[PDB]
Design a protein around this ligand. Structure first.
Ligand SMILES: [Zn+2]
Ligand SMILES: [Zn+2]
Lengths: 138, 6, 137, 6
């Protein structure tokens, strides 16, 4: 019907990921709302309320019932283009859609790159210290 | 809600 | 970049299928032209100039240099929606594009169905003749 | 051109 890579652009798909979301009727951050804001549910053992924007890859936990998912996306990743998108999915032109998918691809890379950077810096701190320790023992 | 721990 | 099912909507993909097409510069039915008209090259041992509309699945052989592929598509499959499409691919809305892909899907089925009809009618001729032969002495 | 024949 539509290729798996592109399904996260669809609100109905995003919604469907919220398998066991705790915040339901009565709350500001319902699945309908989380999905409208671009969030995929992707919980861990560690933080089972974990949610990620499919477009800018910002990850957010510690959700509270009165949290407006849009306000939170705006606050925590103000530069996310998905926020600027006013048209519905079917109303986009292919050029527009393709322009968007490229941005997302670039965002995914930037996220992966920033992760590798932080892990590498961590590995470098361990190595440096170990060598200093040997120099200290000297 | 807050950013992830890292 | 774009799923294989959908690539035939792109002129540059269609063009690429014309690996060994004989009608090149000088001719009215060049690959650029054939592709613009919606044709995929899909040659056989049997007819190595074979070409199909990717959208309505009409198949046409016996191409001549002065053949304008658009005039031929119009002539031989006048009801093909791809002909009605005036916008460039990038200018279509997803709804419009999806409306089109559904029509193509239906067209594919109708073609498969009409082929099966023809094969069944062929098998029926062989059967009839065999029975007639056995009715004789 | 012309309709493929069988
Ligand atoms: Zn985002
Ligand atoms: Zn056609």
């Amino acid at each position: 019907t539509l290729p798996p890579a592109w399904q996260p652009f669809l609100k109905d798909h995003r919604i469907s990921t919220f398998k066991n979301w705790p915040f339901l009727e009565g709350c500001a951050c319902t699945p309908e709302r989380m999905a409208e804001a671009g969030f995929i549910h992707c919980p861990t053992e560690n933080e089972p309320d974990l949610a990620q924007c499919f477009f800018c890859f910002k990850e957010l936990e510690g959700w509270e019932p009165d949290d407006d998912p849009i306000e939170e996306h705006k606050k925590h990743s103000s530069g996310c283009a998905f926020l600027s998108v006013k048209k519905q999915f079917e109303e986009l032109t292919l050029g527009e859609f393709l322009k968007l998918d490229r941005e997302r691809a670039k965002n995914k890379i930037a996220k992966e790159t920033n992760n590798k950077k932080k892990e590498f810096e961590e590995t470098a701190k361990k190595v440096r210290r170990a060598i200093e320790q040997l120099a200290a023992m000297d | 809600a807050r950013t992830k721990q890292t």
